[PDB]
Amino acid sequence: MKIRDLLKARRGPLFSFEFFPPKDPEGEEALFRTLEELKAFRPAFVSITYGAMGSTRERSVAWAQRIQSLGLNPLAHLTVAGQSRKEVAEVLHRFVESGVENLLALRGDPPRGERVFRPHPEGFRYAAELVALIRERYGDRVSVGGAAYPEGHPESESLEADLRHFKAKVEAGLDFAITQLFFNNAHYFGFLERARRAGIGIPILPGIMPVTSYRQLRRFTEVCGASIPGPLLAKLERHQDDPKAVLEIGVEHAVRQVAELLEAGVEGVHFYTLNKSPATRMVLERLGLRPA
Amino acid sequence: MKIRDLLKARRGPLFSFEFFPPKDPEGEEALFRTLEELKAFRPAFVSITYTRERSVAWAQRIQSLGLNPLAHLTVAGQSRKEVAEVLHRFVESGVENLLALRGDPPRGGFRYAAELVALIRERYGDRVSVGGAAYPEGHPESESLEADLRHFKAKVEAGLDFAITQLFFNNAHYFGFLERARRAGIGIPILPGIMPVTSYRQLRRFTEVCGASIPGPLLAKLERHQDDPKAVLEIGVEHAVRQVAELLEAGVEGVHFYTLNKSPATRMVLERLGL
Ligand SMILES: Cc1cc2nc3c(=O)[nH]c(=O)nc-3n(C[C@H](O)[C@H](O)[C@H](O)COP(=O)(O)OP(=O)(O)OC[C@H]3O[C@@H](n4cnc5c(N)ncnc54)[C@H](O)[C@@H]3O)c2cc1C
């Protein structure tokens, strides 16, 4: 099913899950056992994140076909970093010929432990270039999403420039966007209001990742650019070495965030889920969405 | 200044006030003494909720105090020419801001507000700024949130510059209304209207009010302290403060306070917010 059509039905909120590349073959089988269990939940779409800069490229195509084999709807993450325009086009074709109908067009992170993006010398620079590629080569045969940053990309120089680049990416041909994770709902609603004033009408799905360890915060603030609201931050940093209390804190905070988002009639919620972590399952149970 | 211009030019969220009207000459003078007191706060605009002779005089009086009136016009209970007449008198007085209404929040011939918006634009073009009411919680007795939103879109398309919502106690329902509006391609400013729950409850005793859902934790807090009006007051103020702090963090263009002259509720709310 195309995500644009799932969204168009307005059948209540779409719940989606994003997983991380498995470390070894037993972890891979464990992850697919988890996706098999997940089908009962009837997720809207599932994905596993892309790019060890390129990847794992044949691996990520294979994982999308395996997800489809389970009767789940894969969203293929497709990046431009570390790859020529022609390599990007090749991988794109491999996903679509494999029956992937949903693509998330992204710039992609730089390589591990490197902070500054530098384009491939014969590659794209901006995700909006990949969106335009897909639309010109496939049109409506696929449904295309992009990332959105309610608190702004760390590398942008103001929220208003950031919004203007987001509008350009939507106009290149997005059907929906999924946000970077955030912990303060008011910054998501405020992004939605900037987007509304800018006449952007596409569905924008909030992305949520419950805090599961204190060591995540540095990735969250510095790399993802998400602020941690004061009351939450206080609790976390008084409990860093009680991983039991950090987890329960993160779960509680995510439950309350998602409850408000669902009461605000968001088009769906996209959950960033560590492969082994029970954080997301606990959130869903506490919300009444999954059996205890 | 026209409200649409105040909004584009704002240096920060705009605060406006809407007073429920007085019952007697005593309460009339106290209201305008409050309004003069208010000049020090530099409110974006002020108004008084819905007898129309006195309405025009009130607008002139507010202007006389150096305040910017948002004049209310309703289609309810009057002919078309009467409506155009009150309209002309407002605009002849130098009122440049008009709120086109059927019902006039917090309260619960032309038939539709949209027809009055369209009349204003026919007669005055863009030389006035026109708002309408918005209902984040709809008319669920009556239609569907979807049908409600279609009606709002039509009213906006008649020529609104901005909307001010009916009061709400659950911010999520205001954010959900904005999201519905976004998906419908409505980009005009829409200001959240807030009334401390005390005041609303007081008001509902006296007249018919437009509905505003009371969330679980607030409804429960109210009931435990149910007798102890200074407790109940405090609960109302604390709830309105938290609502507004979240609204401002979410980049609302302003906040519109519905107030009983009269109650200490709205004064306390502004005070704790550091306004
Ligand atoms: C849901 C989600 C899933 C993700 N999955 C992955 C994944 O699988 N693999 C991975 O490596 N990363 C992934 N990412 C991370 C993402 O790749 C990074 O955050 C990256 O830094 C930004 O990607 P983007 O697609 O938004 O960048 P772009 O939209 O290309 O924007 C990058 C920068 O350029 C600016 N910009 C855009 N257009 C212009 C213009 N034309 N002129 C000047 N500046 C412009 C933007 O404002 C921004 O600062 C994901 C992020 C999200 C939110």
Author numbering:
A (entry chain A): 1 to 292
B (entry chain B): 1 to 50, 56 to 113, 123 to 289
Pull verbatim passages from the article behind this deposition.
Methylenetetrahydrofolate reductase (MTHFR) is one of the key enzymes for production of methionine, which is not only an important amino acid precursor for protein synthesis, but also the precursor of S-adenosylmethionine (AdoMet), which serves as a major methyl donor and a substrate for polyamine synthesis. MTHFR uses NAD(P)H to reduce FAD; subsequently the reduced FAD reduces methylenetetrahydrofolate (CH2-H4folate). Here, we report biochemical properties and unique crystal structures of MTHFR from T. thermophilus HB8, one of the model organisms in structural biology. We demonstrate that the Thermus MTHFR is a dimer, rather than a tetramer, so that its symmetry is perhaps more directly relevant to the dimeric mammalian MTHFR.
From sets of our experimental data, the as-purified MTHFR could be defined as a ‘heterodimer’ comprising apo- and holo- subunits, and the FAD-replete enzyme as a ‘homodimer’ formed by the two holo-subunits. In the apo-subunit, positions of the loop containing Asp109 and helix α7a are dramatically different, although the topology of the β8α8 barrel of the apo-subunit is almost identical to that of the holo-subunit. Asp109 in the apo-subunit interacts with His77, which is close to the N5-position of the isoalloxazine ring of FAD in the holo-subunit. In the holo-subunit of the as-purified MTHFR, corresponding distances were 2.83 Å, 2.68 Å and 4.37 Å, respectively, where the structure was determined from crystals at acidic pH (≈4.4). While the crystallization conditions were different, the conformational change of Thermus MTHFR is likely occurred by the ligand binding rather than by effects of hydrophobic solvent and the low pH, which we used when crystallization of the heterodimer. Similarly, the heterodimer of Thermus MTHFR may be the physiological form, since it is maximally active in catalyzing the physiological reaction. The low surface area found in the intersubunit interface of the heterodimer of Thermus MTHFR would resemble the conformation of human MTHFR without AdoMet, and the homodimer could simulate the AdoMet binding form of human MTHFR.
